[PDB]
Structures are given as C-alpha cells and as structure tokens.
Amino acid sequence: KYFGTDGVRGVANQELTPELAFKLGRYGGYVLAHNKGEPRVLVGRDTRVSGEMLESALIAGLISIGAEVMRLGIISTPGVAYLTRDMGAELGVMISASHNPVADNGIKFFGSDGFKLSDEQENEIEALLDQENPELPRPVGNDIVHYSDYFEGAQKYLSYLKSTVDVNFEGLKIALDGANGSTSSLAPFLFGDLEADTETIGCSPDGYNINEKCGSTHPEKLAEKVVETESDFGLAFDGDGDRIIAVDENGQIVDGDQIMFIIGQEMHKNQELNNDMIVSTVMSNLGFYKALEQEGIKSNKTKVGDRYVVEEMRRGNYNLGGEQSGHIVMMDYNTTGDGLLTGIQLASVIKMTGKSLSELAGQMKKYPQSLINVRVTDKYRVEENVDVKEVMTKVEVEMNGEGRILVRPSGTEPLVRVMVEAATDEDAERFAQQIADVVQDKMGLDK
Amino acid sequence: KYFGTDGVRGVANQELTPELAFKLGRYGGYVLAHNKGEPRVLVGRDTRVSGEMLESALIAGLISIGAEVMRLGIISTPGVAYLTRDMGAELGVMISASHNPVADNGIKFFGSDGFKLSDEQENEIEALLDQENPELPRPVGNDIVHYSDYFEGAQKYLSYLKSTVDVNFEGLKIALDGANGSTSSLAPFLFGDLEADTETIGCSPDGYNINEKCGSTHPEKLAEKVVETESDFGLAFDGDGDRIIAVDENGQIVDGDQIMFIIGQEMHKNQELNNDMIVSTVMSNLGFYKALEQEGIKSNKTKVGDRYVVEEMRRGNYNLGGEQSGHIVMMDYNTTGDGLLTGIQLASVIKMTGKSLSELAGQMKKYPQSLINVRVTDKYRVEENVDVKEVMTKVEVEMNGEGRILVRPSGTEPLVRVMVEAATDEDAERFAQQIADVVQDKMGLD
C-alpha cells in the first residue's frame, strides 16, 4: 500500500520518486476530476529541496489530465487546507514529510471541503496504481490549460489567521522557531504584524536543514532563547506547520494537552466551546482529564491518530480537539491541525488575562509516565487474557485513584504498548513492570 | 525510434507524453551531461501551451539525476544554443516544435559546444529508453540540488546580437512578424534598440496562437503590412526563431537562398568569407548557384537537413551555410540557424550599401519549382528503370542549360519525389509531367 496513515510518504528519489509523484498527480487528479469540468487544483510544499523536483513531477500529472494548477510555493499544510475550500477548488495537495528529516518527503491530499481524502477515493487511486497501463484522458491542443502562480495565497491565508484574533500583541515578547520549515516565512510576519516583538530562530531554511535540531520535536534551543532574551513565551512549529509546542517564560515546556486546556478553558468561559467538550486521544496525560473535570468540561477519548480526532469532531459537530503532540484542531477556523492558528489563539489568551504562560499552563499537573513494549502473539487477546486482566485490577486497586493504566496495541507493529501513569516515577515504572511481566510470560511469542 | 530529423517531435500529451519528457531529462541528462559532479543544464521553451507541462516533467528528470537546472523561460532555440556555450554549461534543452502548429511540440538537445547531438549520442539515449529497468544514479538528501531561474539570460542574448553588427539601423523602418513565438518579445527590442522604426504583428502570444496565419511559413500577412505601412522591408520569424524569411519594398518574398547570397556577397568582398565558399543543400534553387558563378564564390552541396549543412561546415570550417527554408548559420557568431542574427546581418548589409531589398534580391532569379510525388511499387528499382532513364536522358539533352530535374526517393514512405527546376513554368511541366507520367505507368498500382 502506497498510502499510509497520513498520505504517501517515503525517502525522496528512491521510495518516493518523481515517477510516483507524476502518477499521483495524474491518477489522483482524475479521481477528483471526474466530478468537475476543467478542474482547479492548488499545490503547496515545504522547504525540502526534494519538494521542487516532486512538485514539477506532480504538476505535470495534473496538467496532463486538463487541470488548472495553481502553485502556492512554500506554505504550511493548513494553508493548503484553508485555501482549497475558500477558493472552491476540487483538490489541494501538500508536499511535505512534517517533522521527518530532509531525506524524507511525502504527498498529502485535501478535498474540496478541506478534509483528507475519502478512503473509497484513496483506494480508487491505488487501483489505478495497480494497472500497468490504464486508459485515461489525454487532452491535446486547446484542451490543455495554463497553470498560474498564486503568490497571493500565502498572505491571503495569513490575513485569515489575523482575522481570528480580536486584539494585538503589543507588550508581548515572543520567541519563534520555524523549524527551517514552511512557517519560517509565515510566523515572523504573522506575529510581527500583530505588533508583537519577536526573537527568531530556525527561520533560515536552505533546503537541507528542515527539522534539524529545531521545531516542535526539538524545543531545547527555543527554551534556551526564551530565557536568554527574557521573552514572555516562545512557540515552536514543525516542518509543515500542523503542530505547535510552547515554552513558558522560565523555559519549561508546554505540551499540546496544556495548550488544549488553556484554549478550551477560555472557549468554555465565553460559551463558545461546543457541547462543553474537547476531543482528544487517550495518549493525553491523566492530569489533563482531571483539570477538565474541575472546569466542568466533558472529555472524549479516541484512538491515537489525527484521523480519529477529526473523525469524532465531525460526527458530533465539536469545535475543539487535538493531540498531546501539538496537533490541535479548531473547527470554527480550520479543518485540520494548524500550529500557526493555535499559536495566535494561545497568545490571545495571554493578552486578555494578563497572566503568564507558566500560570495558565500550571493549572494542570502532568503525572509521570512509564511506557513498555512487549512483543506478543495476536494483540487482541491481551485484554481478554485473564492473568493480564487481574494484575491490571490489582494495579488499579493499589493506586487508590492516583493514576491510570492503558494497554493498547500498535497497528504499525506486532506488539502491545503498556502505558502507566502514576503519582511517582518509581511507582509508574513499578506498575508498568508488574503488568509487562505478566504479559511477557503469558503473551510473549518473543518471550 | 523516438528521435526524428530534429530531436524528438510529437503531439504534446499524445505522441510525446510528459512521461517521455521525464525520461529524456533523466536519460538524456545522464548520457549527455555527466562529466562533472553536479551538471549544469539550461532549459528553454517557446510560447506553446504544454511547453509548461513538458518542462516540469523534463526538469524532474534532470533533478532526479543530479543536474543543476537553470530555467530560461521563453527564448528562441539559438538563445539556448548561444547561452549553453557562453555559460560553460554541460547541456542545453529547447522545448519547441518550430513552425509546427500549437498542438505539436518537441525536445531538442545542445552540447556544451552549442551543436546538436551526434547520431552516436542519439543512439545511446534510445537504448536506455528500450531497457526495461536501467539502474541510474538516484541522489538523495544533500545530493539533490536546487534549480534556479536565469531570466537574465534573455537580455544577455540580445546584447550579444547587438555586438555582431558594427553600425546602427537609423533611417530604416522595418516590419516584423514574430509568429506568436519566442521572437515576439525579442525582435521588437533588438531592431528598435538599433534605431529602426518598427511596426509589428503576431507579437501577442496567448499559448494557443503560435504559428497561426503568420510567421515564416505564412508571410502573406507580413507582406501586406510592409506595403500598407510604407516600410522599407519586413522580416518574418518562426515559432522557435531558427528561421528567417524577408519581404521587399513591394511585398515579394525573399527566401533563404537569396538571403544567403546577399550576406555572402558582402562577406566575400570584405574577405570575411572563409575559403570563399557557401554551404547549402541540393534543395537550393539553381538561380542561387548561377549567381554564385557570377560572383567569385564556390559552392558545396549536401544532404537536406540542418545537421548535414553544419556538419560540412565544421569539417572544412566554412563560416556561412543555410537552407532555402530560412535556416541560416553564421559560424563566426552562432553554431545553429538563428533567425534574429540573420535578420540583423541582412539589414546590416542593406544599410552599408544604402540599396533596397528588391535590387539585392533581383541579383538572382528563382526558377519555378514543380514538385510531384508518385506512389511506387518500390524506389530502388525506379532509378535503374530504362524507360525512366530514357525520358530523363532525353530531358538532359533537351535542356542543355535550361535547368535541372532532381529525382529523390523517400525511405520514409513508398513514393518518389519528382522535382524539376526550369526557366519557364511551361518548360518545367513539360518535363515534370512527362517524367511523372512515365514513372506512374511503371509502378504504384496496376
């Protein structure tokens, strides 16, 4: 299967080749081009050098079927999602591998509604990939259209982001890390235009340095800068700009759960939070759930992955959801995780309250976590297994209520993931080992 | 066999697909550009839509191989050839189909020396196209290079063209037809910068109007303009600007043969002509050859085609050669047929003498041409046939000096081309039909 969890990803020029990018543009176009005359498609990318070669290969595929291609250049993945629906386009494509290093690259698609592709269409694309020679339209002469360069899209996206906040950031000092990625050209202008004084790092891309000791994945240098410049707070983005991780005034790190809590707290007070609930994955820390209970906010847990958070939010029409990693979705403004949008909305809360990030983030304490992997036969049996159930109960019994345990299998791998959250590092490691031991003896294929 | 007479030509997205353009960039790049670590290749195109689509596919092939691509945008084919030599670039690529209509497009390659590919280089590329899975370099990470835009090149090409002339064009009013091609943005500036007054048509390309009722192939619209604007003369260009056709004061057409004669005449007296000779194809009219006898110029005849003209020019190092179609090569300045260069050099001769085109064109008379194609059973028996030999032999005797018949079979298709050039139309058809009648009786179809 070419399509993975989040589009088609591989190492650029061997696993993900220009020939594949051409096929994805031609086939992906036709699947999305059987429903409109003279299809309009927009394509964006991040700062990887391999994006230039893949884009030209992809654009050739889109043109070869008759589409009107609109090159956005360097833009964040949410920018593609927003522009696609706002311009009424049939499809949007983002070329990026997010946090992965420069060698890797990927191709992501967006529908006319700003959402990821439907699986029936994803499979139809793959069915065309299976055919050695599929007959397809071959427009000639006047039937081919001129593509256009839509340099306006980046600022049109930025102006929309500016519209969401209702106050400027004067009096705030903010440090930004663009991860040498698509945000490098967007975050300095966006916050600078809102009157915030800015200190920047990771905003000098060269085509090979994306996500190199910078970004949401590596926030240390940012925390170093925030303390050095005595800034009020700092924000770190990833290569394609769908995730954000924050740093407070003292250099402590604020994860997605805390950011989700701060923003959901303010939405709750203003009664803009839909159904007084926040969607999230179970991987979020226990302290996050208890803080939501204190604030009277119902919590909904879903399986790990962007697919399921957004899936759940659409089903019930919830306006806020996200993951601990920093991938946070605000339905009222965008249809996918947007680090830039989440960043300004966080800064808005800091401006209105007159507080600091450490105080707003300090509202919830994160319990220590211990994680263990056990290579088992058949992953469904684990929680049906009697011995596994009983030790979990004992562990559950021993913690009066101060902690929780999670036993989940990973779809990518053939092993189970033992997650324990407890009051103390030593407790968390101990309950995890007790549970992992029981699984290892009775479920360890790879004993 | 993908390669034709002038590179790979076909209808864009049907005969030649972006998939093919990708392979030509990937395979052609490896074969022709790899004697340096990060080869530098230059890419240009004309105004046709699909030039955008084929370019992106080609550039992907070049990058996937490790090349440093430098886009030139819209430029004439000689511009690519000239720039490739001046920049020390490993290879140059031009995306165009020349005079052909908008639907067609093509890919032509240039070596570091500014010359088209050798048949050996042509053969090697086709072998890679045939291989099911050839293992070629696949650079990853830092190994891939950034492509770049060299739009500055177009003005450097124009400044170089200005350098070739030693005098201005003040006092001249010139009409230009750009064929909605690459010359559309270059010829008005080039002649205007030389102080000539300009009236232009066919300089409004929209991607679908190239070579549409204008250009070297269609000079009727320009000749109309020359008379109406009361201009001294007019110049017509093709889609990719490797050909030139001129129009006199009265609207008559001046072909490549006459343009070659005018330019070679001035070179000869000034002794700029190397070995006092001009290279040309057999397709050239006899009046061109007779005028060369009146002057002190020798002449070499070669097989039809751009390649063979320049090939002969390199072997003996002659500086002037061309075709009747308007594809003319000036070795001292460029390595391929350049319509813009020839346009300046033609006008340059006019200003120095102070004469007009009609007087310069009248130096040679064009004998009327009659062309007939006959379906045959085969051609390799047609030259041997006695009845054909007998009518042709009778023809050689009847015209002691009246002209010449040329009989040339096509390997491509099973017909014989019967061409006769004679003093009067009435003579030629007496020879053209008589010969074609004899050929028709013997082969083709019972």
Residue numbers in the entry:
A (entry chain A): 3 to 40, 43 to 451
B (entry chain B): 3 to 40, 43 to 450
Sentences from the study reporting this entry:
In order to gain structural information on the S. aureus DacACD/GlmM complex, we first set out to determine the structure of the S. aureus GlmM protein in isolation. A sequential fitting of the GlmM dimer structure followed by the fitting of the DacA dimer structure into the SAXS envelope of the complex with Chimera yielded the best fit for a model with a correlation score of 0.9196 in which a DacA dimer is positioned on top of a GlmM dimer. In this model, the active sites of DacA protomers are occluded through binding to the GlmM protein, while the GlmM active sites are still accessible. In our model, the DacACD active sites in both protomers are capped by the α5 helix of GlmM and neighbouring residues.
In the human pathogen Staphylococcus aureus, c-di-AMP is produced by the di-adenylate cyclase enzyme DacA, which is thought to form a complex and be regulated by YbbR and GlmM, two other conserved proteins.
